Amino acid sequence: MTEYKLVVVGADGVGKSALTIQLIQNHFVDEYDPTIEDSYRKQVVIDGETSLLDILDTAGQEEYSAMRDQYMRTGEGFLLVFAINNTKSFEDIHHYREQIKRVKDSEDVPMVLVGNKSDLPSRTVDTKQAQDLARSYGIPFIETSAKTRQGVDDAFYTLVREIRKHKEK
Numbered sequence: 001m002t003e004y005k006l007v008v009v010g011a012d013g014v015g016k017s018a019l020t021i022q023l024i025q026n027h028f029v030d031e032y033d034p035t036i037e038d039s040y041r042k043q044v045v046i047d048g049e050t051s052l053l054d055i056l057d058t059a060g061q062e063e064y065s066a067m068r069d070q071y072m073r074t075g076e077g078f079l080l081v082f083a084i085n086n087t088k089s090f091e092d093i094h095h096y097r098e099q100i101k102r103v104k105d106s107e108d109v110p111m112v113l114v115g116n117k118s119d120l121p122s123r124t125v126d127t128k129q130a131q132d133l134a135r136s137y138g139i140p141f142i143e144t145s146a147k148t149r150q151g152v153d154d155a156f157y158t159l160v161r162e163i164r165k166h167k168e169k
Ligand SMILES: Oc1cc(-c2ncc3c(N4C[C@H]5CC[C@@H](C4)N5)nc(OC[C@@]45CCCN4C[C@H](F)C5)nc3c2F)c2ccccc2c1
Pocket: 009, 010, 011, 012, 058, 059, 060, 061, 062, 063, 064, 065, 066, 068, 069, 072, 092, 095, 096, 099, 100, 103
């Protein structure tokens, strides 16, 4: 069966775990241990294709080791998640994108930019600013809310579609 290895990256607190648990369990977690990195599998049908999504929800200390490089390199596509009420998390997107390119040793890595927490009124990152960033990277931008589930399926399925495009090259 077709399988996709998806990796969810971004600053602490942006909603990586809540996005992952919504996709996998269809519920919103108000609290999920910030330090816990884990992986989950889900069988999905996307554009008629049955596949298994293996999703790594990243966490942990900031450390750079050969072992970490090697397991991040196994990801086939990456969600670059920031929160729309946290400018620093948007500023950190560049860093996560450069580290992914470093370990994949490629400029052409499937990615999707994800602006999460779209339900909150306190926005500090304008939608146009994030659309411009995604355009400069050549990747899709999706606004999500793990809380209301807006955009959650779209973010992950869009990443699968980006992987397919890559595999056709
Ligand atoms: O070997 C690696 C290690 C990594 C990696 N692991 C972990 C990282 C990390 N953690 C700390 C917090 C945030 C998420 C998790 C893991 N909890 N924090 C940052 O940066 C945080 C910032 C804020 C404070 C200063 N720093 C520099 C920049 F200002 C942003 N970067 C990381 C990184 F790059 C890889 C990441 C993606 C792809 C391949 C990778 C290979």
